[PDB]
Symmetry: C5
Subunit: 103 residues, 5 copies
C-alpha cells in the first residue's frame, strides 16, 4: 500500500526520515544478554540501532527485526549506499523502522 | 509442471508478466508493525512489493515469501538483471508472485 | 555411504545424471500458492525444477529442499559451473535430487 | 541503551574491551558434540571463542549466538577489519560478547 | 575449552587432523531421501562428508550440522583456503567434525 519509504514512515508517530545517501561507517553487533542488538553509525556521527525485541513489538515484527540485522550487516560489508532511513526518534540511539538503498 | 515463469503466471487470476531486463534500482525494507514488507523499483519508475504475510496466503507460501525478500536483496546488492516478474495486478504496488533472472 | 553424485544417484529409482559443465543460464522462483518452487535452465535448453514440497517428501528432505534453492540461487549469481545434476525423470521438468560443482 | 561497544561492554562484569583494527586471521568452526563453537584468532595471536550455548545463556541470546558465528564467518571471508571486541574474561579463550567493525 | 582445532580434535575418539592448506575442489549436495548430505573433495583426491543427521547426533549438533554445510558451500564458492579438518575416521567417506580456515 505505501509505495516508498516516505509514505510508509508517515504511517507511524515518532518517526522521521534521515536522508544519508552514504555507506555505513561502522557496524556493531551484540550477543550480550538483554542487549541482543546491532548499532550502526555513519561518517557524520549519526548513530542508529535495531532495537532489542520486546513487548513494544508485535509477533510479525520478530522475523523482520532479524532480517534487518542481516541487511545492515551485508549493506555494511558490500559498502552499499543507504539512501534513507525511517527511524523512531523517541529512542536513543534512534531506532530503525525501515531502510532504502538506491542507484 | 510449469516450465517457465510465463506458464506459471498463467495459472493464476489477476496476474501479468512484466519484462524488465534490467537491474533493481532501489530496495526498501520495513520492520514496522503491520508493514513488514519490501518494495523495489526499476529505473523507469515501475514499483513492486512483496506483500505483508496475511490471510490471502496459505501456509506453504510463508517460507516462500521470506525467501523472495532474500532473493530481492542480493539481486539488488549484486546488480543482477531480472528478466521478468509475474505479478498480481489486483494490488498496488503490484505484488510479486514470481521472478526470473537471466544472464 | 556414497562417495560422489553418480553413486548417490544410482541408489534411486527413476533417477538420471546430466553432465553440464556450464553455469546456470536462468534462475526462476515462485512464491505463488501451490507453486512454491524454483526453475533453472542452461544454454542448451535443459530445464530442471526443485519440486514443490509435499507427500513424496520425508521430514528430512524438508530442510534439504530449502537448502537446494539457496544453493541454486547463489550458484546462479556467482556464475559457478555446475558439473552434474542427479535428476528424477518421472517429472517434468526433471526434478533435482543432487548437484555437484567443480572448479 | 549504549551508543557504542565501549559503553555496552561497560554494562557487564568480567567484561573487557579489545582494540584490534585487523581482519581475522583464522576462523575455526566445530560441529563435534558438546563443542559446537567457533574460534577466531588475530595475527597478534589473540584468540577468542563464541561459547557453546550453555545454561549461562538466557533464551533471547540463542538466536544471537547463531548470528555472531554468521558474522564471524562472513567478516573473515571478506577480510573485514574488526575494530574492537567486548569479551568476557572469566573464560579461556575469552568469550566474544560484542564486536565492532569500522574499516 | 580447546584454543584450537587440534586440541578440539583430540577430545574425541576415532578422529584425525588433515592439513590441507588448499581450497575445496568440488562440492556436492543432495536432497535425496535419507541421503541429505554434502560431500567435498580436494584436488589430491581427498573426499569428506558432512553426515546425514541420525541417531549418533545429539540435539545441540543439529544446527551445527546445517551451519557446517553453509560454511562448506560458501568456502567452496569463494575459494577460501581451508587449513585443517578434524574428521572421524570410522566412517566412509570420513566425516567432518571441525574446520579451520586461515588464508
Ligand atoms: C506511538 C506509539 O506509542 N506507538 C506504539 C504503538 O501504539 C499504537 C498506536 O501507534 C501507532 C504508531 O506506532 O504510531 C499508530 C499507527 O498509525 C499504527 N500504524 C499502522 C500502519 O498500523 C501503528 C502500528 O499499528 C503499531 O506500531 C503495530 O505494532 O501504531 C498509538 O497511537 C496508540 O496510542 C494512542 C492511543 O491509542 C490514544 O487513545 C492516546 O490518546 O494516544 C496514544 C499515542 O498516540 O496505541 C497503539 C497501541 O495501543 O503500540 C505498539 C505495540 O503494538 C508499540 O508499543 C508502539 O511503540 C513503538 O514501537 C516501535 C516498534 O514497533 C518502537 O519501539 C517505538 O519506539 C515505540 O514507541
Ligand atoms: C483470484 C483469487 O481471488 N485468488 C485467491 C485464491 O482464490 C482461489 C481461486 O483462485 C486461484 C487464483 O488465485 O487464481 C485459482 C488458481 O487456479 C489457483 N492456482 C493454482 C495453481 O492452484 C490459485 C491457488 O489455488 C491459490 O492462490 C492458492 O492459495 O487460486 C479462486 O478462483 C476461487 O474463487 C472462485 C470461486 O471458487 C468461484 O466460485 C467463483 O466463480 O470465482 C472465484 C474467483 O475466480 O477461490 C479460491 C480460494 O477459495 O485463494 C487464495 C487463498 O487460498 C488467495 O486468497 C487468492 O488471492 C490472491 O492471493 C495472492 C497471494 O497468494 C495475492 O495476495 C492476490 O492479490 C490475491 O488476490
Ligand atoms: C567413540 C564413540 O562411539 N562415540 C559416540 C559417543 O560416545 C560417548 C563417548 O564418546 C565420546 C566420543 O565421541 O569420542 C568421548 C569424548 O571424549 C566426548 N568428548 C567430549 C568433549 O565430551 C564425546 C562427546 O561427549 C559425545 O560425542 C557427544 O555426543 O563422546 C564414549 O567414551 C562413551 O563410552 C562409554 C560407554 O557408553 C559405556 O557404556 C561404557 O561402559 O564405557 C564407555 C567409556 O569408555 O559413550 C558416550 C555415549 O553415551 O556418543 C555419541 C552420542 O552421544 C556418538 O554416538 C559418538 O559416535 C560418533 O559420533 C560422531 C558424530 O557425533 C561420528 O558420527 C562418529 O562416526 C561416531 O562414531
Amino acid at each position: 500500500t505505501p509505495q516508498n519509504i516516505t509514505d510508509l514512515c508517515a504511517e507511524y508517530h515518532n518517526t522521521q526520515i534521515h536522508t544519508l545517501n552514504d555507506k555505513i561507517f561502522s557496524y556493531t553487533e551484540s550477543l550480550a544478554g538483554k542487549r541482543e542488538m546491532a548499532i550502526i553509525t555513519f561518517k557524520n556521527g549519526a548513530t542508529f540501532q535495531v532495537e532489542v525485541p520486546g513487548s513494544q513489538h508485535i509477533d510479525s515484527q520478530k522475523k523482520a527485526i532479524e532480517r534487518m540485522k542481516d541487511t545492515l550487516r551485508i549493506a555494511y560489508l558490500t559498502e552499499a549506499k543507504v539512501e534513507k532511513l525511517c527511524v523512531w526518534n523517541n529512542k536513543t540511539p534512534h531506532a530503525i523502522a525501515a531502510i532504502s538503498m538506491a542507484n
